[PDB]
Structures are given as structure tokens and as C-alpha cells.
Amino acid sequence: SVMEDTLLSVLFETYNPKVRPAQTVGDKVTVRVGLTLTNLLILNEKIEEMTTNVFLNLAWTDYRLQWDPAAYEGIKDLRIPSSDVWQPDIVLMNNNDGSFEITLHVNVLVQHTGAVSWQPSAIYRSSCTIKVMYFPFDWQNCTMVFKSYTYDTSEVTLQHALDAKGEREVKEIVINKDAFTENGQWSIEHKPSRKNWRSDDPSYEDVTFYLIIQRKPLFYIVYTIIPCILISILAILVFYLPPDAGEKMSLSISALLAVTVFLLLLADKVPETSLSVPIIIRYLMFIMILVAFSVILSVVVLNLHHRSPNTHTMPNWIRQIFIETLPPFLWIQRPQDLKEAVEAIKYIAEQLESASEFDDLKKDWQYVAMVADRLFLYVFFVICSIGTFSIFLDASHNVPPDNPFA
Amino acid sequence: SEHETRLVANLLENYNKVIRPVEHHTHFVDITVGLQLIQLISVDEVNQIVETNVRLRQQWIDVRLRWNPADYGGIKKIRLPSDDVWLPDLVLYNNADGDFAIVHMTKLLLDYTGKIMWTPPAIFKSYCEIIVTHFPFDQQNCTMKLGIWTYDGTKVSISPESDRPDLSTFMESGEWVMKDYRGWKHWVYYTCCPDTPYLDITYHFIMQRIPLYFVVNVIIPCLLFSFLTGLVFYLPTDSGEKMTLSISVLLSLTVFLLVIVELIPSTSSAVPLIGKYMLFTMIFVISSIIITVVVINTHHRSPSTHTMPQWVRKIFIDTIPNVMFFSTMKRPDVKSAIEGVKYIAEHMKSDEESSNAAEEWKYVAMVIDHILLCVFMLICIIGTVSVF
Amino acid sequence: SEHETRLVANLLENYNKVIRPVEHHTHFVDITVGLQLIQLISVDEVNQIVETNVRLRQQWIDVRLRWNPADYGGIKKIRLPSDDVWLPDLVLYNNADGDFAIVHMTKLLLDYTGKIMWTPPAIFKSYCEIIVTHFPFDQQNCTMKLGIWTYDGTKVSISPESDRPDLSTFMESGEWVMKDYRGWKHWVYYTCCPDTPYLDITYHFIMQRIPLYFVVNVIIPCLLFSFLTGLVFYLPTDSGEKMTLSISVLLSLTVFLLVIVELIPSTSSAVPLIGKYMLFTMIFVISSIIITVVVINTHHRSPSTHTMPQWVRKIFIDTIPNVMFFSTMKRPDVKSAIEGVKYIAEHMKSDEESSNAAEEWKYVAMVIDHILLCVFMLICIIGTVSVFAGRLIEL
Amino acid sequence: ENEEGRLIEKLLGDYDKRIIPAKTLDHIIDVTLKLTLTNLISLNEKEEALTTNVWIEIQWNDYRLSWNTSEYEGIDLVRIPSELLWLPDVVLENNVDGQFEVAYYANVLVYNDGSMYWLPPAIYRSTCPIAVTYFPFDWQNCSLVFRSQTYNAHEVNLQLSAEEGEAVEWIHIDPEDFTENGEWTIRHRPAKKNYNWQLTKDDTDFQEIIFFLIIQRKPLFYIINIIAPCVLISSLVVLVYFLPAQAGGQKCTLSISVLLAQTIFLFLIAQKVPETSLNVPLIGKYLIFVMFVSMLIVMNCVIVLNVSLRTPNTHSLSEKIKHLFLGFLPPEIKSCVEACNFIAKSTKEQNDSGSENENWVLIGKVIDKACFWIALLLFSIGTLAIFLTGHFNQVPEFPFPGDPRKYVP
Amino acid sequence: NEEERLINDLLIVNKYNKHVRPVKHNNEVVNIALSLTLSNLISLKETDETLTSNVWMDHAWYDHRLTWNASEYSDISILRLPPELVWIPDIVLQNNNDGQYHVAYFCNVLVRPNGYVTWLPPAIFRSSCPINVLYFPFDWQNCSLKFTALNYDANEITMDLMTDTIDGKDYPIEWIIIDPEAFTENGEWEIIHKPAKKNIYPDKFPNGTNYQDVTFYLIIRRKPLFYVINFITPCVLISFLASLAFYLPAESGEKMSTAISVLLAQAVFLLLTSQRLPETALAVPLIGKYLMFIMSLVTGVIVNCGIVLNFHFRTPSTHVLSTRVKQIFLEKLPRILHMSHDEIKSGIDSTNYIVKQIKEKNAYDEEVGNWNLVGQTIDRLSMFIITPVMVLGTIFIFVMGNFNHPPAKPFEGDPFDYSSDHPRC
């Protein structure tokens, strides 16, 4: 309108946007800073970077942009392009890329009392350190630190924002149910805000918004844990197979290779820091070592099973331990022509008797192998069950604190 | 502020930002430069690029921007857009993938005496000569060479603010540890003329990698399969499964070699220790396969077409088995009917002879297996002392 | 030159770059548009996006920029920043994910008669309807549609420079071969009103792929796996390796799935030719495994439980072997002692009978193996030819 | 009071940066180019792009920006931001992306005689079509092509720099500043002015300056970490000829396993070379050869197994085959008596069948021993030949085969 | 050229201010009618949950300042003016990913002598629409483009859907406009519905920028041929190969190899499925459910083959074949399953001993054979129990997946079709 043109011409005749508004030398500008989260896009753990879509609710007072509405047909407020007025260089300090400033420069709203309000939008890529000890059963604590890049506490005073009907300060990230998309991999448990100072430097002050987010591990559970449990079952089973089937090595080595490949195809996802080993990797290493020992003891059992008196002599201690003591505990108890003819028959009989004795000794060796195999079966069933249950119970009891501590 | 509005109006009225801020063209601008490292974004070993997040504090004097506070209500400091005044064109000489100069033209602080302090941010992607010879236990020394581009030392002079870059607010990495860091100023001359120094400041950081991640995710499995390598010599030949185990170990090791090669740069300056040891383990497994194939061939040697040489019998049945202490080795028609019975007896006799020869061959093979197992355990106990 | 400085000052003094260069507002500005393809950067079949490097030559006449050379020291041509004069807003109508208009504001040549020549470079990412029916022996035809975005035919009219693009300085792709290229101008009208045409120029390039990378990286391994698959039927059942070999082939092909999936296009419009070939190979291997399991089961049939049906004996032991030319296959205590000897003799008779029956079962299994070997080699050859030669002949 | 201020105000006042500084109608501006390579960042094969860190030194003469030294207290050199001056739009034409112009627009040094000296640094990514034929023992011939994007040969005359009268026909490399790339070695680095005779002098592409980088790959890493493993694994196939041909010998297991390992190496090589369809890399050819040989060895193992496990039931051992393969290449008493006779007869029959089986096994062993020598010879010859032809892929002696000049400082 | 004089009069003589709303009195509202045209659907990469679309935004409003009497000047009936000279409504896609809120190309605006301004810029938008993987690869997605006006509040500008006329009556355009001639259907997705809505949020206040909204919804259906050919049928066939492990005799020492290989191939297909999906945790995808089911089943098959092998190799020297086992596995189940002078004294003593040894060996062998028969019976029973379970599970899962059509009407509670062929009234 014409009156809007007149008012704008009056307001910006000598107004210099490069000069911070201070009625008197030494005055400070109170700036209210709040955040509204529209979407929590990504939490890339490979680069320790959280991407968010946000609005910044900034408010301050500029004594120069004052007018009397009665003189301008009762215009109570104006929408003025944001580059025409002074604004505090509020930036996200702990960004990962180089983008400090906002992305969308929506125009500010100015009221006749001089109260400037600005709600720019931004796609911010902040940097939060990942605590990789319970991944994927982990909760992260990612912070966004906002402050004026240029002005210090001797020039501006940061404060929290006010609620919709400004009566009390808002000390949280605002979430607008109408415009907010759930991540689907993370759930927001706490979202406080707080002003932080530094003891050594009295010119520092910032407003930090904290996001405590808990991961939903269904994807990892299915796609990594379930196959690993199946592989461990096969590793235990290897000790029920009979050594004569000639398939112990196939089964055990297949399990070992499968679990190793599952470990390899997980560096694409697990974070690359070195302050701890994530619980999933610890479980995979545990299963890998268990299967390797399964391979070793399968080799030992086969070696025992394929012995014979022509090659080995059973020592007393093996007989005492495996033939006598263990089995009850494991419930695994068990004329010249006629002269030539007679000589041939006697030779045949002697050969058969010798073969019988040989076979009895060989069967003793095979029984030792059977008993050792059964013992190993029980031992590894116990070990695998206890270890798996312990690891996943420890993982389960990992929840964010009820008090955000900020 | 009316006072500050008037001050800014007067300061920039007759001010040209293209001209050096000196009171005589013979003098030089003295710029104090300090580098403050905020974060170590990344170290790309394959590409050899170190991405760091930094602030570049620069201080100098511009006598054209001084004012008397008494005339302006007592204002002693202001903030001005860096685009409004003369700025030193400080450039990163060894830039690799980023921006050579500062591109975030933030505001700068100006005193009433003309003292300008300007601390813009930057992402420096500088070239880093990565020495992959002790990977993953390596330490890296790569730098950031900063210098004024178009002005020589007689026009614009740069000096480091302090002996070392500022890491007061450094964010702990989680992949690297800062062992040391220092900055040095270099004068450079040319055969042209010795009265025109060219100055630069090189900052360098010594970074010690934290090896836990690579150890756990790469070395442990490789050691596990290397250990499983020698186990094949305990598997009896009758099980008919030696080749399965040996070849599985071979395949696993080659996969891990693939991982290693795609984890390090392709430079030929030095041979990585991890790669050398992986190649040696691969040779080790190949020898394992060849020798176990020899053992298998011996075990099934047919007594009909092969007769045991005397030296083999002596060595492998008369002397070595005694040496192994801890082992458990050993050391009408009635005439037709009569003729048939005699034939059966003779056939059993010949079969017994052939068998006895076969078990002699099998015993030789088993002895060779024990010898190779002992050799493998000896190599293992030698290896476990190497890490200590 | 002071002459050129004065000329450029005089030309742009009273010049408004937001007005069309026409004497009267009812006229139109005739623009000659030509396309110069410099490089075919890439083709993306999954997203249907063709990325090309081009130069967009444009010529027109600006009446307001005439001058008399005699008054300016004989200067006849100058170069001016394109930002300083009126430009036609040529837009790529079918842009996929690149820039819609020219963003490299280079300089343009201006003659003393007002004739303006402007050749800005561009990176065009165009939407390309990709057909994967004959991949990798596929021929792709897709276009670049150009037109003036905001002006109709009665204000700014565009005409093609030539009948086809210019490939004088066209680099060699190394993955595609330019079979053909042309350009056509279309008028378009709307039910509103027939006195207002809307013009455009479509430049289409017909390309033919060089199918060597895909052959040597996909097709050859498929053939090797197919051959090894049929190789399993010559392996005797006594050697416990039939399932080992066949299953190893199957797992190797399954792993090859990773490579093929990452390489071949991932569209759902139609089944690629190599898609059909790979599905055929998978079914081939699986059928071989099933039949091998059946053969192995047959070879170990025991006479104690199973009795050979008459038809099996008639077919596989009498009929088929005769007509298999290639193979060489064949076509007191004394009483106790006496009673024991008789018992041994009768037991040996029974063992001989059982062994003969089991031996017959083994023979049947071997004959089935021979038949399947021939049939499977024939099927492999026929399937490969049927899948590929049909398209390959058309080339 | 800085006199540079008033000097520069005098110079730039009444100066139009859109006008080429031509004194008269027929004047042609001599634009002089020189290149200083400071770091050969990379050579990406997948996208066929060479990335380098260079300083590009461009010199010309602008008669407008001249002054008299005595009038300005002896000032004979000023620095003016390049955005305020006329520049010859010299750009790198063979750029993969759209980046034509320089990275950092540094100031220009202006001397009192009008000489303009501009030394912008740049990170240039240029197209370098690769010749994979001799990978990894190959050498590459990359080119940086510079030409004016705006002015033709009738307005600007590109040339190479000259110090002390001698033309600088090479890429300048300062030993102190330069850092070797480890993965590559710079063998030749000539420069030359080239003309596109198919065009005329009014086409802006008639003239260009081409700097050449001939780089030889250092292969020690590639050898140690790809070839030696691959060769060692592929040599295992010959071992199948010593395993027994019966259940538990595991001939097929070993053969197929080596084949799969070779396939893995082939894949590894796949994601290291361009997807172009002009040639097959040398290492790729070697891998194809060993895969084919191992397939043949699998076939031979299958045939040997089939031969060895033959029995009188199925196959009849012809006397011809036997000779060829074993002579050239290498009341109550009646019942009791009947029972005894039957036992003897049956035992003898069984033994004869066993003897026939043994003969078949021997034939198999002989075939196996012959095929071992055949396969070992084939594999060794193929490996040695392929890697010897790889090792004799020398870089040419001269940068341009026709010329006799060495093109070095 | 009269256009120069007219534009000078409009923008310079009248002192046009491009930073002031086009309203005579500063309490009225500017009605911006906006519509959307879909040039083509580029991609819907599911891993990052992004929809990349090429659209044309049609804005239309009134500006009383840009009015002129066509006769006073020459008969000029239309003007083209760059958008940097006139007031423009900054309407932004609020739910984007890459930080591109604005249109890509700022074309000229067309101004009519009555003040009507129309602006049709093209844009490339990367919006965020979450993926519902419940029925992947037989799924359909519901993505949204939400446009808001953040520069003015609802009391200053009112967004609306563009209207159109057919026979003298005007109706809103409540759909994304697709030009059938120019539109090329996407390779992987098929558009089913494309509604357009203007949303009010009454719990907010009109003196704010979060009160209005205009949302264009794209409901799309995946064409499941790539995945049916490259993922589903290879996996199904390789899984069915598991059943054959029971038809393989235990003498051929290759049962476990077959079963384990089947399991490993299934693991490969699991890897692919993981690689092709986002990390969400709302539900397990259909193909994921099938893979879990079949992998558990094949693990059971491996365990059962192991048990069969353990039974097959029992011998009288290590185990006792009880009468219960004989009765169960050799009589009942095989029927139910339809399964098919000292010298002469020394000689006499020696021959008696030989006979005794042979008889003992025969008894040993026949008990071994009985154990073998028990093993075969267990094999057959397992095959019968497991094969139908596998087949029925596969069929059930995949038909349930194939019966997942889109709901045939967007906005379930609404009886309107939002089809361009049946405008309201």
C-alpha cells in the first residue's frame, strides 16, 4: 500500500543494518533463541554427523524500528526482508561441514514497539560423538550449539524462547505435531535446552539443544543376529554327527566362514572409532572363536576315531578317563594233502582271530572318540547358551537415564 | 546506535579497500597469524588428504580506521563486515581438494587505535604424505603451509602468534591422538635478488592412530585363520577331509588380503608390514597345501607298484619315532576242494603281505604329519614371542 | 582502445535488457539455434538419464546495437558480457536433474549490423526413455527438447541452424557409438486459440552400445558355469563328489548374482536379455542338481527293500544301451562243522544274488547318467543360441 | 600517505574491464602461458580423470595500466584484484566437470610498463582416456589443454613463456616444492602450441596450448599384493594330479576351489579399471587364461575319476586300450564237498573282478601322470609369457616419437 | 517499441516497490492460487527415503499496480517481466532434504492488462517421504510435497488451489497435473492417485506462518518384476533344494553339504535384501519374513539330517537297538508312509571257530542294516512333514504379498476420487 511505502521510507532513511542496536553505549541486546525440529533426517555413524531440518526462533528488540500506528492507518507490524535489518549472527558452532549460517532467509516480522522476530529454516549437519559400546542397542546424545559468531556476552545476552502465548520460557526443542516426521530408526526420549558458559573465558555463552535418541535395533536384530544364532546352533550340532559320516569338517568350516563373512559385512555399518568395541562385534567375535574351537576339537575327535593298534598304543590315562569315568556321567554307556588242508584251515582261523583282536582295539579307540565328542557337545551347548544369554541380557539393560542432566 | 552509525559512516567515507593499510608505501604490514584447530574431520589414507576444521586468527593495524572515542560517546570497539576493509590474502599452499583461501567472510573486530582482529573459520583439505609402513600402528606427520600469495616479505609480513597452534578447544578424535604440534616460519629467497624475502608459516601435527578398531576387525580373524592353517597336519588322511580345511583357510586369507589392499594407499614408496606378513602367511598356507598333498599321496601309495626305499624306512620307522617323546605313537573232486582251500589260504597270505606294506606306508605318512605339526607349533611359539 | 570504450559506452547508455529486440511490439525475434555435442558423458538406464556435454549456439539480431564503423575507428565486431544484453531464455523441457537453462554466462560476439552470436557451454541431463529388452545389445533413442520458456511463437520464434546437430569436435565415447542424429522443429497449438503457436526443437541421437565389457564380464562366466553344470553327469557316483561339484557350481552362480545385480540395469519395464539368460542358467543348474540327486538315490538302491520294476529293466538295460553309439559301455563236532560249511555256502549264494541285484541298479543309474549328459549338453547349446542369436542376427 | 592509493585510483578511474586492450585496429594481444605442477593429486581410472594441483602463470600487456615511476615516488609495481581488470579468459577445455575457470582469483601484479602478471593456483580435473592394455605395468599420457574461451587468433595470440630468450616448452617442476606421488613417476612433461587446422582463425578453438604428462605406474605394490597371491593360488590346480582317484581324494573339491579363488581375484580386478569396451587389461587376460586352464583341469579330473572307478559291470577293458596305456605310455560228504567247491569258485571270481578294477585304476594313474606334465607346462609357459610381455612395456624414449628433442630444462 | 515506455511507466514513474504486498489497504489478503505439474518422476531411492521429482509450479495472483489501459498504449495485451523486478510470493517446499527450498529457474512472469500475474517456474525437488517396507517388494508408497508460505502469515496471503473452467462453471484443480503426451512413466513406479489438498491447522493462529499449507500427494505402486526375477524365484528354487536332502541316501556322504549350501545361498539373498532397504524398524519386510522363515526351516533340516546320519551309523558295539525303536520305525511308520589223530581234531576245531566268527559277523551286519533302515524311515517321515510346510509357507507369504493393492480411494474417510476426469460438481 501507499502508507506501507511511507512507513518503510521513514524507517530506513538513516538505518544502517551493519550497526548493532544500542540505545546507549554499553547497552546489551537481549536475544531469545529457540529451536523447532521439523525432521531428524539422518544420524550417519560413519562420519559422526547428525542431519536435522529445523526452524530457529530468534527474537530481539531494535529501538530504531519504532513507529506510532495511529499515524499510519493503524499498521501494527511489517514483514521486512531479512537482509534490510540488523540481525545477530546466530550460527550453529559445532557443524560438521562448513555451513554455519541458516539456509532459508525468510523475511523478518517487526512490531511497532520495535520487537523483531525471525524464524529462518535450515538443514543443519551437526557433529556429535558416537558412543559405540552398545551399538546397535545404543542411545546417542547429540547436541546442537547455537551462539553469535561475532558478538560476545558484552554485546548480546542470549535467553531462552517464550511459549506460544509468551508468559514463561521454553526450555526444550519445540515439536509441531502437524509438521513432524518420525525417523523410524530413532526415538526421541529427551530434548532439553540450556545456556552454557565457560569458566576460563567470561566472554563466552551459548544455547545448546540436546537430543537424547534411542535406536530401534529391529533391522540389525534380524539381519545379523538371527543368522548368527542359527550358525551357532550348527556349530554345536557338529558334535552330534558321527565321525564316519565324513562331514564334520564341512559343517564346522562352513559355520566358521559364514560367521566370519557376517563380521566382514558389518564394517559397512558399524562406526569406525576405536574407544570401544560395539556389542554386536563382541558377540560376533565370541561366536567366531567358539566355532574355531569347534573346528579344533572336531579335528581332535576325528584323529582319535581313526587310530589303530598298528599306529598308536592307548595310554592308561585315556582309558581311565574316557572308558571308565566319563561314560557313566554322560549317560553314554555301551597223507600230505590232508596235512596241507589242515594247515590252510589253521592259518585261516589264526588270521580271523588276529583280525578280531585288532578290531576290538580299534573299537576301543572309536568309543573313546565317541565319549570325547559327547563331552564336547555338552560343554559347548552350555558355553554357547550362557555366553549368548549374558551378552544379550547386558545389551537389553541399556536405556537412557530418566534425567537428561541438561 | 546513533553514535556508532555516525562513526561507521565517517570511517568508510573515503576508504579504498584495494590499497594496503600503510602510511608509506615503503613500510610493511605486520600481520600476526595464529591457527586454532577445532576438529580433525578426517584422514583419507587412500586419497592422502587430511580434512581439518580450523579458525585462522589474524591481527593487524589499519591507521585509516582509527577514531577518537571522546567524539563518539566513548565507543572503543566495533564490528565491521570483513568485505568492507582490506584483508590479507592468506592462502594454503598445499591445498588438495578444498578452497585455497578464506571464503566465509565473517565480521571483524576493530579498536579505536586501528587494531583489527579477524578469526574466520575454514575447512582445510591439505595434502598428507601417508606413510603406510607400520599400519595400523603408524603415526602421521602432515602439515598446513600458509602464506601471503601476492605480497612479498617487504610489503606484508606474517609472524606466528605463538610457537604452537592453539588446541585449547580441540575435539578429541576417537581415531587419532595428537602427540605433538608446532609451527615454523620460513624465509625463502631466489637467485633473482636477495633483498625480497618470501615468508610462509608451516604448522604440523603428529597424529598417532588408535589401533583398536583395525586390530579387532582385521588382525584377529587373520591370526585365527593363520593358526588354523597348521591344524591340517593333525587330521588323519582316512577322514578324507584335509583338502577341505586347507582350501577353506586359503580362501579366507585371500579375502582378508583383498580387504587389506583396499584399506591402504597404493603407494610403492614403502612396503606395508601388514601386507608383507599377509603375503608370508599366504606362502605359509600354500606350502601347507603342497606338503599335505604330498602326505596324502604317500598315505595311499599302492604297495604293488611302489616298494619302500631303505632310506625312507630307516629315517621314518627306525629313528624319528623314538625322538617324539610326548606323542603316543607305536615304536575225485575232493582234490578240487582241497586245492580250493589251499588257494584261499594263499590268497589270504598275499593279501596280508600287501596290507602290511600299506600300513608301513600309512605309518610313514603319520610320522611326517607329526613332524610337520611339531614344526608348526615351533613357528607358533616363535611368533608369539615376536609380539612381546 | 578508446574507440571501443566509447562505442561500448554509447551502445548501452539507453539500453534496457528486459525488452525484446523488436522495432514494433507486434513483430517477433527470429533466433537460429544449433546444438554442438562435444561429449557423451554417460547414460543411466535405471534412472533413464543421459548426461551430455554440449554447446548451445544461438544467433539473433538486436536492432538497438547497430553502429557505424566509420565513426569508431573501423571497429566491426566486439565481445560483450552476455549479462549486459537481452538473451533468449532457452530451456531444456525434458531436463532430468540438471539445470533448466544456461548458467555459464560467457561472452557473446556482436557485429556492427546488430547480429549477435552466442555459444555457451552446457551440461544437459535429459530424461531418456531407456529400453533394456536387448541389453547389452541395445540401441537407445532419446532426445533433447529445447524451447523458449516464457515467449510464444508470435513473440520469439526459434529455427534450427542445420538439419542435424554438429559432431565435428565430438569425442569418442568408448562405450557408445553414434549411429544417427537429427533435429526437428514442432509447432504446437491449444484449443484456446489458433493464432498463438508454441515452438520447440527436438534433437534426437540414436546410439548403439559396444557390448564387450558386459560380454567378457557377465556372459562368459555364465557359459563356463553352464558347461561345468553338465559336466557333472560324466562323474561316477562312486566318487563322493557329484553333489559337491554341482552344489559348488550353484553357489558360485549365486555369488555371481551380486556382480550381475550391481552391473545390469534394475528397471521393471521389461526383462533384459541377459536377465532371461541368467534365469535360464539358474533353472539349468537347479534341474541338474535335482536329477543328480535322483540318480544318486537310484545308484544306492538296495535289493532288500526295492525290487526293480519290469519296465525299468526293459528300457534302461535292454533297449537304450543298444542305441547309445557314442559310449563304450558294455551291452560230535564233525556234524557241526559240516552244517557250518553248508551255512557258509548258502550265505554266499544269498550274497551273490543281492550283489547282482545291486549291480543292476548301478547299471541303470549309469545309463541314466549317460542319457542326461547328452540331453543336458544339447539343452545348454540350444538355450544359449535361442536366447542370443535371435537378436544377434538382426544386427 | 600511501601513494599506491592515488596511483591505483588514477589507473582504474576511467577504465573499462570489458574492452580488450588493443592499441589499434590490428593489434593482437600476446598472452603468455606457463604451468607449475606442485602436486599430482590422483589419476582416477573409474571416472577417467587426472586431478592435479598447479599454478598457472599468465602474462600479458595492458597499455592502459601504465604510468611514470618518477611521478609516484618510485612505485614500479602494484597489486590489483583480478575482478577489476580485463583478463584473457584462458580456461582448461578438457575438464570433466563444468569447472572452466580458475579456483582462487588472486591479485594481478601490474608493472609500470603495463606488464600484467597473474599466477592463480588451481585444482584441475582433466579428462585422461586410459589405455588399460598393459595394466598394471602401463604408462599413461595425460593432457591439459588450455585455450581462450572468448577471443580468437585475430584478437589474442597464445604462446609459451620464455626466460632469457629460451622458450619454456615443459611443465615446470621445482625439486624443492614438488612431492613425488609414490604411485606414479613423471617421465616426460613437454608443452606445445597446437592448431586445429580444420577450423579458421575466427573460431576461438583454432589455437591452444597443450601440456603433456607422461606418467609411469610404480607396480611393486600391485605385484606384491595382487599378482604373487593370484599366481600362487592358481598354481595349486596342478596338485590335483597327485590325489587318489577315489572317494576321499577330493580332486573336484580342490579344482573347483581354485577356480572360485581365481574368480574372486577377477572381481577384485574388475573394480580397478575403466568400464570402457576397447581392450581387456593384461591382468584380466591372465585371469581369464588361468580360469580357462582350471576349467580344463576340472574336466580332466572328472574324466580321470570316471576312468578309475570303472568296473567289469559297466565297461569292458579292451585289449587295445590296456596295451596302449600299460605298455607304451609308461550222503553228507557230497554236500560238504559241493559247498567247499562252491566257496572256492566264488572267491576266485571275486578276486578276478578285483584284478580288473585294479587294472582300470592303473590306467587312470597313467593318464593322470601324463596330464600333469601337460598342464604344468601350459600353466608355467602362460604365466611367464604374460608377465614377461607385461614387464617389457617400456615408456617411449622421446616425448614425441617423431621429434629428436628431449624437452627438458 | 511501446513496451519500453509502458514498463518505464509501471516500474519507474509509479515508483514500484517489490518489497510491499500488492494490496490497496494493509488489511486485505493476497490470494495466490498455486498448482503443480509433474514433468517426470525421477527416483524414489529407498535407502535415504528421498523422492526426487521434476515439477512445474503454477502461481497466479493479482497486482493492482501492474495494470494499464491497453488502448492508451499500443494494443499491448501482455508483458513479460523478470521476477527480480516485481513482487513474488515465496512459496517453499518445507519437507525437503538437500536444503533446496526454492524453484530452480526464475523465469519471467506474464502480466495481463487487468493486473493478473502468472508465474510458471520449473523445479527439481528432493522431498522426504518415509518408506513403508511392510510388503516389500509388493509395496506401495504415499509420498507428499508440502508447500508453505513462510514470508507472510495467513492474514496477509491466502494460498488456494488453482481453478479451471469447462462450461462456464469453475472448479478447483485438486490433483497433480500430468500431461499425457509429454509424461513418460517411471521405470520402477506407477502412479495410482495424485490428490491435492489445502490444509488448515485450527489449533494454530492465523497471525503465523504455520497456519496454511498446500500438500500434493503421490501414491505410487512398485512394479515388482526386477525383484521377482532376480530375488524371489532363485531363492525359492534354492530353498526347495533343501527338501531333496532327505531323498539323498546316507551312504553318499553328501547330505550335510547339500543342506549347508542351501543355507549359505539363503544367507546371500538375505545380504542383498538388507542392502536394498532402509534401516527403519517399523516392521520386518515381507521378503525379510520369508527369508527368516526359510532359513529357520533349513536350519531345522540340517539338524534333522544330522540326527538321521547319527542314527544310520550306529552299531551293536556302541548302541542297543531297543524293541520300542524297532516296533516304531520298522513296522508302523514304513507301513503308514507306504515305504517299499590230533591233526583232524585241530582241523575240526578250526573250522568250527571259522563258522562261529562268520555267524557273529553276519549278526553284526544285519543289525547294522536294521539301523540303516531306521535311518531311512526317519528320512522319509521328515521329508513328508517338512516339504508341505515349506511349500505352504512360501505360497501363503507370497500370495498375501501379491494381494496388497492400494486402497482405491485416497483419504479413506472421503468419498471423492480426486481424478482429473471427474471434477467436483
Ligand SMILES: *[C@@H]1O[C@H](CO)[C@@H](O)[C@H](O)[C@H]1NC(C)=O
Ligand atoms: C616522467 O616524470 C619525470 C619527472 O616527473 C619527467 O621528467 C619525465 O619526462 C616523465 N616521462 C618519462 C617518460 O620519464
Ligand SMILES: CCCCCCCCC
Ligand atoms: C573251509 C572254510 C573256508 C572259509 C573261508 C572263509 C573266508 C572268509 C573271508
